[PDB]
Amino acid sequence: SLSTEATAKIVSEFGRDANDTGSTEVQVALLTAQINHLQGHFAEHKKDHHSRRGLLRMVSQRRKLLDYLKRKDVARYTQLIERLGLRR
Amino acid sequence: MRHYEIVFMVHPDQSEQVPGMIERYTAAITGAEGKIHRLEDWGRRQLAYPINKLHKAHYVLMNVEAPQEVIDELETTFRFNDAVIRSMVMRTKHAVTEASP
Amino acid sequence: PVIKVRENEPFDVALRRFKRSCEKAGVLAEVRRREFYEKPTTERKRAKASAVKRH
Amino acid sequence: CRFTAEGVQEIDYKDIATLKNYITESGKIVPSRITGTRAKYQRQLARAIKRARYLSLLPYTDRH
Amino acid sequence: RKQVSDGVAHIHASFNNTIVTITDRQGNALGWATAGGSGFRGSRKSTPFAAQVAAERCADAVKEYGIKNLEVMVKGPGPGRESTIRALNAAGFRITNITDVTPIPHXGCRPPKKRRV
RNA sequence: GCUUGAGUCUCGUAGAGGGGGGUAGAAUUCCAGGUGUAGCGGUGAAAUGCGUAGAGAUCUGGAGGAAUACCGGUGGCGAAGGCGGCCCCCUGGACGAAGACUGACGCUCAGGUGCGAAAGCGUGGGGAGCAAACAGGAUUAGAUACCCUGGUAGUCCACGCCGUAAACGAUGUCGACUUGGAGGUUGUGCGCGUGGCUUCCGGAGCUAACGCGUUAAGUCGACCGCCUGGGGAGUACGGCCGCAAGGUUAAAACUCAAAUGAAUUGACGGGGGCCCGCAGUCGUCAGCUCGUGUUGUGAAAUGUUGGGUUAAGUCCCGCAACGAGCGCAACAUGACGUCAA
Ligand SMILES: CN(C)[C@@H]1C(O)=C(C(N)=O)C(=O)[C@@]2(O)C(O)=C3C(=O)c4c(O)cccc4[C@@](C)(O)[C@H]3C[C@@H]12
Ligand SMILES: [K+]
Ligand SMILES: [K+]
Ligand SMILES: [K+]
Ligand SMILES: [K+]
Ligand SMILES: [K+]
Ligand SMILES: [K+]
Ligand SMILES: [K+]
Ligand SMILES: [Mg+2]
Ligand SMILES: [Mg+2]
Ligand SMILES: [Mg+2]
Ligand SMILES: [Mg+2]
Ligand SMILES: [Mg+2]
Ligand SMILES: [Mg+2]
Ligand SMILES: [Mg+2]
Ligand SMILES: [Mg+2]
Ligand SMILES: [Mg+2]
Ligand SMILES: [Mg+2]
Ligand SMILES: [Mg+2]
Ligand SMILES: [Mg+2]
Ligand SMILES: [Mg+2]
Ligand SMILES: [Mg+2]
Ligand SMILES: [Mg+2]
Ligand SMILES: [Mg+2]
Ligand SMILES: [Mg+2]
Ligand SMILES: [Mg+2]
Ligand SMILES: [Mg+2]
């Protein structure tokens, strides 16, 4: 999983504060960081199906949070996907 | 850094080579900004069963804080040293300083 | 199961000490268990059955 | 259970004097139903014994 | 005909037969007998009595070596585990040790399939 | 807008969760050599087989593969399939404590997509043990079997395919609510609490019954999947998928008046326990019944079972049964019935 330090950085960049761990932007940024990190794992470990199920849950959760944010605030949504480099 | 507990046991004829090996292996670790929390030379003990005809071996314990690569490097040294008949490297959660049984 | 026959001990006492060491170690039951292959399904069924009658 | 009573956290593979209480003379690990070890400590004990056996601090069997 | 004060009796007690082999303590065989080669075939071969007679005849086979004391290595589950050792005692050997040496795999190889009798 | 559903963060906990790499000890087989000598092996009994060209046994050295005794547990983990020596590397989930944070972001899900035991298939490796096929030996009326001696695919590894199993709790997922008892396992607060997971018993209720019973098959709500007599048939045709084996979707004509579930009384078993007998009929065997009560929706059950004891349902003691009749016994005598004898 993501380190305490790497997590704390992401909360600082995308959150309102260090305490603001709940915001959709932070949550999406955290999921994105771990999805990107795990690409190296699954490149090496192609038949780690059990861990991949956890990755696909991260992907699905991110998709649901982005869809929530899109319909709640299109502008924040647009900013976020630019910063994180997501298609949608 | 990660905390490791290392046991290795040396061929009883190379018991006199062990002080040089200990100071060499600790030199490898200290050079990587690593720490030595414990270092016990248990000396020649009776083996519970024969390992490669031998009935005794010279045990050395050391608890170490280091990067994983220098530990990986130290395991390859044990592999390719015929004096080192057997070794075990174990992750520990915390540092261990206090003396063993 | 390894008995050293102790001094001024008769042979029956030596031999029953060997018998008791064997039954404690469980040699013959382990041999009889390993004579034939038991499918894992059969093993689990046996384990469950023993448990249901233990309780 | 001694390990619970005596406040033990991690059973040490190096503590051969302790481990010898939980093996038979054949070298086999004694069941928890005999010794009254708690399940959590029985698992630690089994691991400790298997490490000790690897390092030839304990025998696997009474006939090497 | 060399003298061999101390020896080892190896008892191979299978379900079908008993082989008694007396060796020196290097494991060089000095003499042997079997339940099958002692006037017992089929059902009688796999009995404690046939194992007794095998042990008696093995003691006769090693008469000239002057073996006085024996260790006993017992191997297998068969009917001639105990009766063999009693016979070696009756033959006038000093039994010093008794050891079970039955092979037990620590898992090992898949055994043959169960018989559907 | 809100924080109660859902989610994020912090600290910690247990775990055969997964992927990769390394390594240990036991054992089997094989090879080489020593000692030793007539058997070994196998079965119900044998024989095939192995062995004087020195087996089997025993000791020493070596090679190689596969699986990890004990621990071990109605134990643990995983969506399911499944996962078990030890060590390291990479990695998924769960749970608890105390807050902080987001602010309905949720539940379910046709089509879709992924994962999916074993066998099987492709290419390349590997091959100890085991073992479809196959061969021989037995058994038998025969024995294309069961048993024995061998033994190839396969079982193992890499990568790809297959997509099925009594893939089962034969029980879809999510949420709420509704008496108890005894355990297991794993957290945590001060003997006493409080969470998670799990096993057994049982209450109301439910159920055709069996049973289920806060882990519901109870009481409700949301959404999905599926059924509509037995066969024909999960078959044909068509489509799609597959290297193939085949999978998946899925009819009709025709045919029967049943098929089926659970439970009841018998009878029967090459099921178990306990007894008896020189081991017209069954059989002089000790049985067979009824009234009333009670239990069950009901067929029925109880009594008549049970602990003892007896030649005996003989007698005693217990018991939702309480009594009674025909038998037993007592004073040759054949209970209710059976064989359309
Ligand atoms: C008209 N309708 C579309 C029918 C239908 O609903 C079918 C179904 N499975 O529900 C068919 O299979 C149906 O579509 C269909 O395919 C039919 C058939 O294939 C055949 C064939 O091939 C040969 C004989 C009879 C039939 C059949 C009577 O079963 C056909 C019925 C078809
Ligand atoms: K080495
Ligand atoms: K949907
Ligand atoms: K083969
Ligand atoms: K009923
Ligand atoms: K559904
Ligand atoms: K019909
Ligand atoms: K009645
Ligand atoms: Mg066999
Ligand atoms: Mg983990
Ligand atoms: Mg692999
Ligand atoms: Mg397979
Ligand atoms: Mg293949
Ligand atoms: Mg075979
Ligand atoms: Mg066969
Ligand atoms: Mg199916
Ligand atoms: Mg299953
Ligand atoms: Mg099951
Ligand atoms: Mg089903
Ligand atoms: Mg679970
Ligand atoms: Mg119940
Ligand atoms: Mg079909
Ligand atoms: Mg088709
Ligand atoms: Mg009656
Ligand atoms: Mg009467
Ligand atoms: Mg009564
Ligand atoms: Mg009368």
Side-chain angles (χ1 to χ4, degrees):
Chain A
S1 301
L2 213 69
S3 62
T4 308
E5 283 69 52
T7 300
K9 280 191 71 171
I10 294 158
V11 175
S12 308
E13 309 320 298
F14 293 92
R16 262 51 67 183
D17 212 300
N19 298 1
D20 187 57
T21 63
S23 69
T24 308
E25 284 88 317
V26 167
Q27 289 195 53
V28 168
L30 288 175
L31 291 174
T32 303
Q34 190 57 200
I35 291 157
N36 290 346
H37 172 69
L38 285 174
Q39 298 301 122
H41 173 80
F42 290 108
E44 181 168 1
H45 299 286
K46 298 187 186 71
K47 308 308 180 291
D48 186 1
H49 297 305
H50 292 61
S51 300
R52 191 171 283 115
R53 202 174 94 102
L55 175 73
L56 298 181
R57 182 170 154 186
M58 292 167 208
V59 169
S60 306
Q61 190 161 298
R62 188 175 63 183
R63 175 75 282 132
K64 287 173 170 183
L65 288 168
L66 282 170
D67 294 349
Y68 169 69
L69 184 66
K70 188 178 163 70
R71 69 194 169 69
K72 198 71 169 179
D73 194 296
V74 294
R76 286 168 62 194
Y77 168 76
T78 305
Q79 290 164 240
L80 181 66
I81 65 171
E82 181 58 62
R83 287 180 70 180
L84 294 175
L86 307 182
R87 301 194 307 292
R88 43 168 289 259
Chain B
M1 278 188 302
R2 283 176 172 182
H3 294 112
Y4 297 89
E5 188 164 297
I6 306 173
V7 177
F8 66 82
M9 64 198 85
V10 183
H11 198 296
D13 298 317
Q14 279 73 5
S15 181
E16 305 306 303
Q17 279 60 47
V18 174
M21 283 191 337
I22 290 168
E23 68 193 61
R24 268 186 280 120
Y25 299 150
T26 56
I29 288 156
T30 51
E33 203 182 298
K35 305 196 182 186
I36 320 297
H37 295 296
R38 190 163 64 175
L39 171 70
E40 303 184 0
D41 193 298
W42 296 348
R44 300 192 312 294
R45 300 176 49 93
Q46 198 72 231
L47 299 178
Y49 54 81
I51 300 169
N52 194 2
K53 306 288 206 299
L54 303 173
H55 288 65
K56 291 193 65 147
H58 184 116
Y59 288 68
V60 180
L61 173 70
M62 47 188 78
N63 291 71
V64 159
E65 189 178 4
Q68 68 185 15
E69 286 77 3
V70 65
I71 300 292
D72 286 310
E73 282 171 290
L74 183 57
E75 287 188 68
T76 59
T77 309
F78 296 155
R79 186 173 291 289
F80 304 120
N81 183 6
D82 74 303
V84 181
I85 63 163
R86 187 165 295 175
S87 57
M88 192 177 236
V89 175
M90 283 173 72
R91 276 282 291 286
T92 58
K93 207 178 295 187
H94 312 111
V96 191
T97 59
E98 197 270 300
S100 76
Chain C
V2 182
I3 277 61
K4 285 189 58 50
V5 178
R6 44 180 173 233
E7 279 82 62
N8 299 345
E9 180 202 58
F11 174 74
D12 297 62
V13 176
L15 185 63
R16 290 172 295 188
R17 189 161 48 104
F18 175 70
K19 289 190 209 303
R20 212 153 174 113
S21 194
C22 291
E23 294 202 0
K24 190 175 182 69
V27 177
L28 305 200
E30 192 67 14
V31 171
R32 284 170 174 121
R33 194 184 69 70
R34 291 171 173 291
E35 200 179 1
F36 300 107
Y37 178 69
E38 188 171 59
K39 282 207 288 178
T41 185
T42 312
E43 185 211 64
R44 289 185 300 263
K45 189 175 66 161
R46 177 173 55 64
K48 183 62 170 212
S50 66
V52 170
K53 280 196 287 168
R54 273 191 302 177
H55 165 62
Chain D
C1 182
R2 311 214 73 174
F3 305 105
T4 314
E6 301 169 5
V8 184
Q9 269 185 294
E10 286 76 58
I11 297 172
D12 195 359
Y13 70 85
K14 297 180 283 95
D15 190 9
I16 297 307
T18 302
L19 298 186
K20 279 172 144 67
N21 302 311
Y22 300 93
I23 61 171
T24 64
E25 287 78 60
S26 295
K28 288 170 57 167
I29 299 163
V30 179
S32 63
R33 69 203 292 180
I34 307 304
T35 61
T37 304
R38 262 80 178 193
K40 181 180 152 68
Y41 291 112
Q42 187 64 25
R43 295 194 302 279
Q44 292 185 7
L45 178 71
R47 290 181 207 113
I49 290 165
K50 291 158 180 186
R51 291 169 190 130
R53 286 168 173 178
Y54 170 73
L55 292 174
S56 205
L57 298 169
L58 290 178
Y60 288 83
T61 185
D62 63 344
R63 53 163 75 133
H64 286 284
Chain E
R1 295 95 167 179
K2 293 162 61 62
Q3 292 286 108
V4 196
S5 184
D6 50 354
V8 184
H10 299 259
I11 308 168
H12 187 105
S14 73
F15 284 121
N16 290 324
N17 199 359
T18 312
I19 306 172
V20 188
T21 301
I22 286 167
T23 69
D24 71 357
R25 300 188 46 259
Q26 288 71 245
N28 299 298
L30 308 178
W32 64 263
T34 69
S38 301
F40 307 101
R41 298 305 310 169
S43 186
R44 300 213 196 75
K45 183 162 64 73
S46 56
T47 62
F49 175 66
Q52 188 194 339
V53 173
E56 289 165 5
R57 290 174 78 253
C58 187
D60 287 300
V62 303
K63 68 174 71 188
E64 304 187 61
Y65 285 97
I67 305 140
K68 192 265 170 186
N69 60 100
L70 282 178
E71 311 190 1
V72 177
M73 303 295 206
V74 193
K75 183 177 291 194
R81 283 176 67 71
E82 50 163 61
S83 63
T84 303
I85 320 178
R86 289 173 173 289
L88 293 176
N89 190 245
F93 287 107
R94 180 183 168 184
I95 307 304
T96 67
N97 303 336
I98 313 176
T99 299
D100 188 283
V101 300
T102 309
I104 299 294
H106 292 176
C109 295
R110 185 184 180 113
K113 67 189 176 162
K114 185 185 174 188
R115 302 176 70 227
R116 299 192 295 287
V117 289

